[PDB]
Amino acid sequence: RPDLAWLDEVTMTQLERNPYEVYERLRAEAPLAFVPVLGSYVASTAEVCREVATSPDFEAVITPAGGRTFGHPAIIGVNGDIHADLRSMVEPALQPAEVDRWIDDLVRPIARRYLERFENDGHAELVAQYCEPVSVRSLGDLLGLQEVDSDKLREWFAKLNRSITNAAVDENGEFANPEGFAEGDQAKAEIRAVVDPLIDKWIEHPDDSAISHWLHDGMPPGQTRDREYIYPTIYVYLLGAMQEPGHGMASTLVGLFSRPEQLEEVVDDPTLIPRAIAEGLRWTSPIWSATARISTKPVTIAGVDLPAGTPVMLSYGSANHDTGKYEAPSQYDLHRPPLPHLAFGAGNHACAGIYFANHVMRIALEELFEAIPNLERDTREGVEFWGWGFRGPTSLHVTWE
Ligand code: HEM
Ligand SMILES: COc1ccccc1O
């Protein structure tokens, strides 16, 4: 596309460091645009992302780097009967009525455990010391990975993150950094070494862990789903389900620190925490551009005539800064009117864990503000955000008296 010649000079590193300037141009110039370094069309506005995610002429497709990492059948990349089975498999523990039965006794003692390690120090780095551990310990226990240390769960989602966002392609459309997939392969090998013995045991002795239920639920007597059939969805969980609640917590905190009067409001009135989190997810979406859809017939989107079989990356983190929807979207504002947002996606492949994720984040922040009401940002240490596919702060240094 001639007027988008400048996109030829956009780099993967630029998008990872801060994608918002490029995507501000894309939203104005070309809401659906082919980005050469990504080797794909990209949807940048709320209207186009929603249309693609919900269209009857599109279905799920995994990104190239996602496919190289997760294989088949990753719940995010399949459709039809297989997708319906995988959704039936994961949905029971995520049902709102079910989550409300046990989410408090799950998350609150975990939040207290990690808080007790530092709440009297007067300083902490909240990403590593609190947000990520609460996120991975809660979900890890739900899955049946109680014996997998939070440090290890966090290392796995970091490696899987970098692997499935290893999207850069060269002039010929081949991956520019094929060696970047090796650490994804290494994480999967380690995951297998840990989880294979657990699956062995769950096949013979089912329990209330989620992975045990993935093996057994809905199956004929004495049968389980083959481990190869569920492993890619295990990997999906060990990346985003482990990573995103902690990132959403942390981005919410960074935004509140950027509006000190709003931080004070929420500490004083913790019933405002759900609204603070919803704005945090819009303001810096944890899953920023990690999923995609593929057209199943010729379709015209945003004035582009796409052939059948065209992938489109859904850059939801950009759509959540759509100035057709939001005033001054790069500013965190607790008091923004509650509007629809796309941080959980849309359509048949929208996030299955929204209700759970929202409560994990709410409980973590409630406990944090109860334990340390006088939290302040360490204004010497600046907050760097990183990531194009998944985005969040790399650290969050705070102090308190
Ligand atoms: C704040 C935290 C989270 C955010 C922002 C988030 C966001 C998203 C997004 C954007 C997608 C892709 C939707 C699309 O392509 O349209 C997704 C998919 C998914 N998420 Fe969440 N997620 C979060 C936490 C979780 C958790 C904790 C779980 C599990 C307990 C989970 C389970 C899933 C599943 C299973 C899918 C695949 C859905 C499908 O393809 O059918 N998510 N999520
Ligand atoms: C819930 O985990 C994911 C969601 C979207 C893309 C990759 C993931 O691991």
Automatic annotation (TrEMBL):
Identify the domain of life.
Bacteria
Per its record, how is this protein called by name?
Cytochrome P450
SUPFAM superfamilies according to UniProt: Cytochrome P450
The GO terms describing molecular function are: heme binding; iron ion binding; monooxygenase activity; oxidoreductase activity, acting on paired donors, with incorporation or reduction of molecular oxygen
This protein's species is Amycolatopsis methanolica 239
Provide an example Pfam family for this protein.
p450
Keyword list, A-Z: Heme, Iron, Metal-binding, Monooxygenase, Oxidoreductase
Alphabetical list of PROSITE patterns matching this protein: CYTOCHROME_P450
* Residues reported in the UniProt entry to bind heme b: 83, 87, 291, 293, 316, 346, 349, 351
The record's annotation in InterPro entries points to: Cyt_P450 (IPR001128), Cyt_P450_B (IPR002397), Cyt_P450_CS (IPR017972), Cyt_P450_sf (IPR036396)
Q: Does the keyword Iron apply?
A: yes
Give the family from UniProt. Belongs to the cytochrome P450 family.
Claim: Ion transport is one of the keywords in the record: no
